[PDB]
Design a protein around this ligand. Structure first.
Ligand SMILES: NC(=O)c1ccc[n+]([C@@H]2O[C@H](COP(=O)([O-])OP(=O)(O)OC[C@H]3O[C@@H](n4cnc5c(N)ncnc54)[C@H](O)[C@@H]3O)[C@@H](O)[C@H]2O)c1
Ligand SMILES: Cc1cc2nc3c(=O)[nH]c(=O)nc-3n(C[C@H](O)[C@H](O)[C@H](O)COP(=O)(O)O)c2cc1C
Ligand SMILES: Cc1cc2nc3c(=O)[nH]c(=O)nc-3n(C[C@H](O)[C@H](O)[C@H](O)CO)c2cc1C
Ligand code: SF4
Ligand code: SF4
Ligand code: SF4
Ligand code: SF4
Ligand code: SF4
Ligand code: SF4
Ligand code: SF4
Ligand code: SF4
Ligand code: SF4
Ligand code: SF4
Ligand code: FES
Lengths: 207, 443, 191, 196, 333, 318
């Protein structure tokens, strides 16, 4: 019965297998906890610094950025007319010499081709988009990775009163017209969508 | 008469050139001077000769006794003096034990030969004994002994006898002339075989292109309702055993089995005609209707020839070579065996002497398979030769056995229809031989 | 409809072997025959389903309240590998038959990228429990379908006269590349 | 004599990408450029060294029944250490890699060489084998990434080659391009070996 | 601060303990019941996976063996060393298996044995065997289409310029694949030390064989009369040399009418070359020595013996109780 | 004796008249009217592109087959057929190097690397289109650009159907003959010429009616079930050439009747699914390639019952 009671005194193999695995796992967990205590704060500090320099690149006219409360971040997201927003991450207000100089919004995209892409949009106080920057994009290289670079220059200096539209062509026929990247049209319609939520947020904030 | 039509699934339609010899009336041959009688005239064990140098024999004299159950005696075709007993060339390409003999000149018959009687005097055991004594084998090509087929085992039940009068091969019109001229002998042989087996149903398989043979058979049958004649669609390999049995009776012979399992006994028309002739006269099998044809023959025709006459003598009887032959074939184009020299005596089972010239013997070199799927569409056994051939060429005998390479009948349709001019039936024969050799070695 | 969409996306649109670069070493190693491919597919299916269930029930109940997202991979390994060991034990004695030690590829089910990758994706995508099981089963069925089709193609190529330099693994890689080219047509489907 | 023999065997004669046919998911998934291939090769080399040293040092305490959990637990701990260190130091490489950094544990090369050579050999021999095999994997990844980047981006290590009007072969960096390139490279290697 | 270290250690330890307990309680139930006879024999076999010994693969012998259905030397690829290793694992003596090489027993070129009908079809020996039993003038001769070369896995057979295959003695492991795969049943296995071989597989009589090939065995019977040790026999009108009783006296090759036996005249001639140290002038050699090529007076050392001619023999390692006679190949070339 | 030098073989000693060269010559003869209509609608550049593809394919096959010491088999006319069918897939604005690269990829990797003629497993002309479309979408997206007025086309009729803009579609009869305001690939302007070629191929016995008939039938049935116009769906796009000349490929289609029926049904279903719900304006290439991948499974599962075996019930090996 039960293989001669696990060969009488040979229950020790059943005991020692578990004990050895327990000791090895405990040692590995102790090492992992120690290294987590060593390098936990550096990761978040580097992430904050990267976000800060990215925000500085987008809006050079702002001396410093002030963070709006997250309750407001949900508040404007609730009523200005998107079905399931779930993407208005953060809104910052630029500040310089006693006057508000612009806004920066990390919204987007809606629905990308291979997931979601986070686009940072900076709009000046007088109603001019000063530039956009992509900070997270899990797209295929060669097609979706081309959206960060010269193409972003298409979004600079444009007015901030009407929504943008993406067109398939090599001719600029409209002020609110954006030329799509050749070979990648789904991504080019998602970044402009993030710009559309950004200008909607700016229009609500200007009121 | 209720003439019924039957056919099967698959096959080809080769260009039957039955015009140069079919309309030419059948002639005879001159009295031969010398004959080579081999000891291997059948698929069974070879016989042992008893005549030595300097002896004198007559027609029908015994020359070699059988050795085993599946073996048949061999009789001398023409009376004369034996001059040598030695190894001589054979239709299979090898050299076999044989007796060469020059003839006397007057064709004296054996006094011991007597008629066996009539149909009502002859019972089944005596019919089997007469078939064994007369030296009658399968004239359809296989040269299998007839007395083995007529001796059915007690554990197998048979209900009908089928005559195979369907020459599916091109260039061969021997059976056409046989049923055109000797229909009564065919009917008598069918009746004798049916009485020997102990059945009551008889069928005859004749292709529809020979309407004169159909009319002659219908006239010869008379008012006997126990025998029927079937007009089959002109096709190849319709003359085969399994295909004829599936067309006439509708039954299918099981894989790896015999027609005795299907309840049928099938014989060639020529075998029945020879059985009737031996019953009437008592003489053994020493003559055969042999057709000589091809584009290298001046006057192709069908003639009655003895057994033991070399190919050169009969070829010279048919006017000789018009040009230089490139292939000499002993049989049909799709089943014949190619030859090395023309000093080979005619067999009991040789069906035709075919001579192909150099222009008609040129076949293009085999090329890559294009996977057209035409070999599978013409198989009467529903195999896929494009797999069996590729497995045989790569030395994979297990997959050849798994792909049913032993169910092939070697009809040659797959290699005929192939656009790439490949050799599919030779690789399948290689696989068959290797599987049989492995089975022999393992036991 | 949503579960059917998840299964379709896991099997056809986002097949793990042919569209996500997960689980290729056993896809190339044991796909020489159809029967071994089917056995591998069944074993991987059972392992993937059990792994998806256990890592889902451990991720949202144990690790998340305690804020231990850094140990996650290690924990998942202790869920996967041990089970695979039991699977390696099942294939020999429990059922008295089926008698196949795959060879340097049965211990690699723990090392299979399609087993841990589906578990990681299934929390990266924030799916529910029934959705977790359905997506795991769909990924397993996609792996089985891909390996069965590849085994069939290789058994067909067994008769082709491939060159001696390309016999073996290079022809398998070329066949996998052509299969991926064929499967590229499902990209961008929004059902 | 065995140290250099094992190192040379790991570098040239084994070459897990080209001959052993292992570790193929990070081989075909991240070799779109030479820098990513170099980073994967270095990380795999470091993890393989650590895991092989630890396993060969702990060969006398691991029984034959729970070998897989202990082996992959040690490998996973080392992989987590390496991944956190490169998260702290090299964020660009980790961002380019993504999902395959936690998936270093499921590299078939690491556990295959743990269960094949590191379990029944000494510390020095296992260390030499790990060094040689990591160098071979790094060289294979670098060669494949360089070829793929040359054909599908017109650059090596970020420096453009075919001017600026070159239109890239966009399937080169796609999965079929990697599969076809690896098949052709292994075929060329086999032909050169057989004809020599 | 302490609890941040106790929490993961405790969690992973609990998981490891319960998983190890489960695996250990399942392992004892899931018992394979294997014997230590398969794991210790895997490096003794070469692992070539070459089927000429029996069961497929080289991993099939370490699933067998505990039944006695195969001998110790069943694997010829491993040879004497592998056979001795298997025998010492099983605990019995290992036989002295002489190494063997595949050899053709037909020496016929396209010039010596011309064809009589050109052949159309696939270039293979079995395919030519189907087409009316080969196209060669000699029925039993070598076709030369290269089936034995395509079957041999060690690449030890090279088809020569004359059509016959040549087997490299260094690369042949005597696996026996080419012997079974030759349709003409020509390939055989010969010991490496044996040089005098009858190289004609012809079963025909005198005149036919002489007409077919210029180096054909005609069963004249001179080789049997020349042989003294009774090692060569004429069966089926063909000569065959029994390699066990052949002492290589090189006398059958001399008296063959048309050089049908593979050998050269360079042999023996050592009329009892005797080391001076280990003989006591016994005088047991000059008595008869049938051809009388030793005669002397008691022969005190050193031996005064004239060497003019001999028989070869090669058997005088048993007539000496002290083994003073030494055999050395000393002739022309 | 006289030296009668005969020939030796096993069986049969008579063969059929047809061969591979005749089959491919008849395929090209059937393809010729589509080339004529392509030359009429577009101009001399279509013929120039066809010649470029043919020359590239022939040269690539000859060079690769010579470098491998194999006998040169450019006389079976398979390379010319592959080059013509690949040049029929290209737009009029495709540069010459696209055609050369496609021909090199079709002959070298797809065909010659697997063994040669009839020894591959996938469609070469569709593999060379599924590679140029994914590598250079900018050139493979803008198919055909010049009407007589040079600016009244914008898009092509198949994309307008997916976009819902049916107000500028041809009136379902000009799109059939292919005369005015229709623009696709080189050989897809006219469906009547492809229908004539397919009928000629069916008459000659080279292809079987099963795959084209069932393909068109299931496309019509699906388009009628959803609610679209079936005639517009069969006529427009590369349905005709794909069904007649590419789904009926020899080395990548099942050899049995049930296999061909299931292959055609699957091809039609996947084509309609990809067209209606996928990201591409057409899905003939990807559906055909997918059914070429799954062809060995259908071949394995649809074997004909061999004469004699009466369905042994899986109990002879237990
Ligand atoms: N010249 C001609 O008219 C001609 C025409 C076509 C074919 N042939 C050749 O004839 C040869 C015949 O081949 P096959 O495939 O028909 O059959 P087969 O050669 O296998 O044997 C023929 C007869 O023997 C049976 N048989 C064998 N052993 C038996 C037994 N113990 N009991 C009962 N029956 C037994 C067969 O079914 C049949 O009755 C073929 O090789 C063929 O190609 C000649
Ligand atoms: C491919 C093939 C074709 C055959 N064609 C014929 C034929 O046309 N006529 C014929 O009598 N036998 C033909 N046979 C032989 C038959 O199968 C059968 O064995 C023979 O007719 C029996 O002869 P028997 O009546 O003398 O017993 C053919 C065999 C094969 C394999
Ligand atoms: C009916 C028919 C259709 C063919 N269709 C194609 C095809 O799309 N593309 C192709 O390249 N070759 C085609 N070929 C040529 C064909 O290459 C060759 O048989 C093998 O496909 C090689 O892959 C065809 C040949 C025939 C007879
Ligand atoms: S495989 Fe056999 S049965 Fe089928 S066609 Fe060829 S020879 Fe006839
Ligand atoms: S008929 Fe010939 S070319 Fe066609 S599939 Fe069969 S073997 Fe291949
Ligand atoms: S012959 Fe020797 S090496 Fe070859 S498979 Fe047999 S045992 Fe193994
Ligand atoms: S020559 Fe013959 S016995 Fe020697 S290795 Fe080759 S196949 Fe084996
Ligand atoms: S020895 Fe035998 S197998 Fe080798 S070439 Fe000669 S006949 Fe063929
Ligand atoms: S006669 Fe002897 S040596 Fe000459 S070919 Fe025949 S077997 Fe060879
Ligand atoms: S001497 Fe030569 S020819 Fe005479 S029997 Fe001996 S081997 Fe044959
Ligand atoms: S070498 Fe001497 S012993 Fe050997 S067979 Fe010839 S004569 Fe006889
Ligand atoms: S020991 Fe030898 S050498 Fe000396 S006498 Fe005796 S036989 Fe002669
Ligand atoms: S072996 Fe004997 S018989 Fe022969 S030479 Fe020597 S001593 Fe004389
Ligand atoms: S399956 Fe081998 S590394 Fe992913």
């Amino acid at each position: 019965m039960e293989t001669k009671e696990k060969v009488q005194i040979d229950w020790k193999v059943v005991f020692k297998l578990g004990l050895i695995l327990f000791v090895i796992s405990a040692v590995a967990a102790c090492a992992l906890a120690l290294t987590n205590y060593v390098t936990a704060g550096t990761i978040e500090e580097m992430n904050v610094q990267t976000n800060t320099v990215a925000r500085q690149e987008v809006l050079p006219k702002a001396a410093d950025f002030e963070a709006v409360p997250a309750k407001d971040v949900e508040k404007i997201a609730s009523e200005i007319g998107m079905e399931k927003p779930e993407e208005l991450l953060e809104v910052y207000i630029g500040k310089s010499n006693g006057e508000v100089v612009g806004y920066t919004v990390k919204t987007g995209p809606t629905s990308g081709y291979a997931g979601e892409v986070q686009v940072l949009t900076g709009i000046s106080a007088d109603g001019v988009i000063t530039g956009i920057t992509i900070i997270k994009s899990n797209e295929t290289p060669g097609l979706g990775a081309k959206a960060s670079g010269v193409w972003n220059d298409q979004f600079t200096g444009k007015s901030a009163k009407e929504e943008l539209v993406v067109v398939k062509g090599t001719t600029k026929e409209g002020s609110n017209e954006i030329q799509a990247i050749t070979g990648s049209t789904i991504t080019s319609k998602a970044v402009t969508s993030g710009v559309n939520m950004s200008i909607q947020v700016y229009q609500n904030l200007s009121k | 008469m209720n003439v019924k039509h039957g056919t099967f699934k698959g096959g080809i339609h080769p260009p039957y050139r039955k015009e140069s010899t079919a309309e030419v009336p059948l002639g005879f041959g001159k009295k031969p001077e010398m004959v080579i009688i081999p000891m291997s005239l059948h698929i069974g064990a070879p016989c042992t000769p008893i005549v030595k140098k300097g002896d004198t024999v007559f027609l029908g004299q015994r020359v070699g006794e059988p050795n085993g159950f599946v073996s048949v005696p061999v009789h001398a075709s023409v009376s004369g003096k034996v001059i040598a007993v030695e190894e001589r060339p054979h239709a299979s390409g090898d050299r076999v034990m044989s007796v060469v003999i020059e003839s006397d000149g007057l064709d004296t018959i054996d006094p011991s030969i007597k008629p066996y009687g009539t149909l009502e005097d002859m019972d089944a055991d005596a019919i089997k004994k007469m078939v064994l004594n007369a030296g009658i084998v399968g004239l359809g090509g296989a040269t299998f002994p007839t007395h083995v087929k007529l001796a059915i085992p007690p554990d197998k039940k048979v209900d009908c006898v089928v005559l195979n009068g369907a020459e599916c091969e091109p260039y061969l019109t021997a059976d056409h002339h046989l049923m055109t001229s000797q229909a009564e002998k065919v009917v008598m042989g069918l009746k004798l075989a049916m009485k020997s087996v102990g059945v009551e149903k008889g069928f005859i398989g004749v292709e529809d292109n020979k309407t004169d043979a159909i009319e002659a058979l219908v006239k010869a049958i008379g008012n006997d309702s126990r025998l029927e004649v079937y007009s089959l669609h002109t096709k190849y390999p319709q003359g085969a055993e399994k295909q004829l049995i599936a067309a006439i009776t509708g039954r299918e012979v099981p894989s790896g089995a015999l027609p005795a399992d299907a309840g049928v006994v099938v014989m060639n028309v020529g075998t029945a005609a020879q059985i009737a002739e031996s019953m009437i006269t008592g003489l053994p099998l020493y003559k055969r209707y042999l057709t000589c044809t091809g584009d290298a023959i001046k006057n192709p025709q069908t003639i009655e020839i003895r057994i033991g006459v070399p190919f050169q003598s009969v070829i010279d009887q048919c006017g000789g070579f018009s040009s230089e032959p490139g292939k000499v074939i002993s049989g049909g184009p799709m089943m014949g065996v190619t030859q090395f020299v023309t000093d080979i005596p005619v067999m009991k089972g040789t069906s035709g002497i075919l001579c192909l010239t150099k222009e008609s013997a040129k076949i293009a070199t085999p090329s890559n398979c294009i996977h057209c799927g035409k070999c599978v569409g013409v198989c009467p056994i529903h195999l896929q030769p494009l797999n069996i051939a590729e497995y045989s060429q790569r030395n994979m005998w297990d997959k050849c056995e798994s792909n049913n390479a032993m169910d092939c009948i070697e009809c040659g349709s797959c290699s005929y229809i192939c656009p790439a001019k490949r050799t599919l039936v030779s690789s399948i024969r290689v696989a068959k031989r290797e599987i049989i050799a492995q089975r022999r070695k393992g036991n | 409809m949503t579960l059917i969409f998840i299964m379709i996306s896991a099997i056809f649109v986002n097949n793990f072997v042919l569209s996500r670069f997960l689980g290729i070493c056993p896809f190339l190693g044991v796909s020489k025959q159809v029967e071994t491919a089917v056995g591998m597919g069944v074993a991987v299916t059972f392992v993937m389903a059990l792994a998806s269930a256990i890592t889902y029930v451990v991720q949202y109940a144990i690790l998340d309240p305690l804020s231990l997202g850094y140990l996650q991979t290690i924990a998942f390994i202790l869920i996967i590998a041990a089970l695979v060991q039991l699977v390696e034990m099942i294939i020999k004695k429990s059922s008295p038959s089926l008698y196949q030690a795959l060879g340097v590829y049965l211990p690699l089910i723990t090392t299979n990228c399609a087993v841990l990758g589906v578990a990681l994706i299934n929390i990266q995508n924030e799916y529910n429990f029934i959705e977790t099981i359905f997506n795991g089963v769909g990924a397993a069925l996609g792996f089985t379908l891909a390996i069965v089709l590849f085994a069939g193609i290789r058994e067909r190529l067994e008769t082709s006269a491939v060159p001696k330099a390309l016999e073996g693994f290079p022809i398998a890689l070329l066949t996998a590349g052509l299969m991926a080219i064929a499967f590229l047509g499902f990209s961008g489907m929004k059902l | 004599m065995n140290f250099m023999k094992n190192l040379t065997r790991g570098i040239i004669r084994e070459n897990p990408t080209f001959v052993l046919v292992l570790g193929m998911c990070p081989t075909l998934a991240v070799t779109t450029s030479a820098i990513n291939g170099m980073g994967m090769g270095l990380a795999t080399m470091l993890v393989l060294i650590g895991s092989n040293v630890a396993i060969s040092a702990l060969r006398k305490v691991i029984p034959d029944n729970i070998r897989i959990p202990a082996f992959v637990v040690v490998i996973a701990s080392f992989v987590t250490i390496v991944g956190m260190l490169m998260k702290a130091y090299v964020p660009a490489l980790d961002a380019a890699l993504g999902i395959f950094i936690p998936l270093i544990v499921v590299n078939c090369i690491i556990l295959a060489r743990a269960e094949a050579f590191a379990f029944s050999n000494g510390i020095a021999d296992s260390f030499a084998d790990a060094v040689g095999m990591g160098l071979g994997f790094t060289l294979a990844l670098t060669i494949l990434g360089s070829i793929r980047e040359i054909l599908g981006a017109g650059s090596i290590f970020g420096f453009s080659l075919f001017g600026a009007a070159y239109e890239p072969v966009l399937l080169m960096i796609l999965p079929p391009g990697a599969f076809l390139t690896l098949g052709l490279l292994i075929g060329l290697i086999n032909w050169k070996t057989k004809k020599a | 601060m302490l609890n941040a270290i106790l929490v993961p250690v405790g969690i992973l330890g609990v998981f490891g303990l319960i998983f190890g307990i489960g695996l250990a309680i399942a392992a004892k139930v899931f018992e394979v019941y294997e014997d230590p006879r398969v794991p210790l024999v895997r490096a003794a076999l070469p692992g070539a996976n070459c089927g000429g010994c029996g069961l497929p693969g080289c991993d099939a012998l370490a699933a067998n063996i505990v039944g006695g259905s195969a001998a110790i030397d069943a694997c010829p690829v491993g040879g004497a060393s592998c056979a001795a290793a298997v025998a010492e694992i099983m605990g019995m003596e290992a036989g002295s298996a002489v190494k063997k090489v595949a050899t053709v027993i037909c020496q016929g070129t396209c010039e010596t044995a011309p064809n009589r009908a050109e052949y159309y079809g696939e270039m293979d020996c079995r395919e030519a065997m189907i087409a009316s039993g080969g196209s060669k003038g000699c029925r039993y001769g070598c076709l030369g289409y290269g089936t034995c070369k395509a079957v041999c896995p060690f690449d030890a057979i090279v088809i020569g310029e004359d059509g016959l295959p040549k087997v490299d003695p260094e690369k042949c492991t005597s696996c026996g694949k080419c012997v079974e795969a030759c349709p003409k049943s020509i390939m055989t296995l010969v010991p490496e030390a044996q040089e005098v071989i009858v190289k004609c597989h012809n079963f025909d009589k005198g005149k036919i064989a002489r007409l077919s090939c210029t180096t054909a065995c005609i069963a004249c019977g001179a080789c049997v009369k020349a042989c003294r040790f009774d090692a060569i026999t004429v069966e089926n009108n063909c000569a065959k040399i029994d390699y066990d009783k052949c002492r290589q006296c090189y006398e059958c090759v001399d008296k063959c009418p048309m050089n049908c036996i593979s050998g050269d005249v360079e042999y023996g001639k050592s009329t009892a070359y005797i080391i001076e140290e280990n003989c006591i002038a016994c005088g047991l050699c000059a008595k008869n020595c049938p051809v009388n090529a030793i005669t002397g007076e008691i022969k005190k050392p050193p031996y005064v013996i004239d060497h003019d001619m001999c028989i070869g023999c090669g058997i005088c390692f048993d007539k000496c109780r002290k083994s003073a006679i030494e055999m050395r190949p000393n002739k022309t070339k | 004796m006289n030296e009668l030098n005969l020939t030796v073989s096993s069986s049969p000693h008579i063969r059929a008249k047809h061969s591979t060269a005749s089959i491919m010559q008849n395929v090209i003869i059937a393809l010729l009217p589509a080339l004529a209509v392509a030359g009429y609608v577009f101009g001399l550049w279509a013929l120039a592109l066809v010649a470029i593809c043919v020359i590239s394919s022939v040269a690539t096959e000859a060079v690769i087959q010579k470098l491998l010491k194999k006998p040169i088999t450019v006389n079976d006319w398979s390379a010319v057929v592959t080059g013509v069918l690949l040049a029929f897939n290209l737009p009029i604005n495709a540069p010459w190097w696209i055609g050369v690269v496609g021909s090199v990829f079709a002959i070298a990797i797809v065909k010659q690397c697997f063994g040669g003629l009839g020894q591959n497993f996938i469609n070469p002309a569709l593999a060379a289109r599924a590679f140029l479309l994914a590598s250079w979408p900018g050139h493979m997206t803008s198919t055909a650009y010049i009407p007589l007025t040079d600016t009244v086309t914008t898009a092509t009729p198949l994309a307008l159907l997916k976009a819902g803009e049916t107000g500028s579609m041809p009136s379902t009869l000009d799109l059939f003959t292919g005369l005015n305001g229709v623009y696709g690939c080189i050989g897809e302007i006219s469906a009547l010429a492809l229908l004539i070629g397919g009928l000629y191929l069916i008459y000659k016995g080279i292809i079987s009616w099963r795959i084209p008939t069932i393909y068109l039938l299931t496309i019509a049935i699906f388009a009628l079930l959803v609610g679209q116009d079936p005639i517009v769906h069969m006529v427009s796009g590369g349905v005709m050439l794909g069904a007649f000349f590419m789904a009926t490929d020899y080395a990548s289609s099942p050899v049995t009747a049930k296999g061909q029926i299931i292959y055609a049904i699957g091809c039609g279903l996947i084509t309609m699914i990809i067209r209606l719900y996928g990201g591409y304006p057409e899905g003939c290439s990807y559906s055909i390639l997918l059914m070429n991948v799954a062809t060995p499974l259908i071949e394995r599962f649809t074997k004909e019952r061999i004469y004699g075996v009466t369905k042994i019930k899986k109990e002879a090996k237990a």
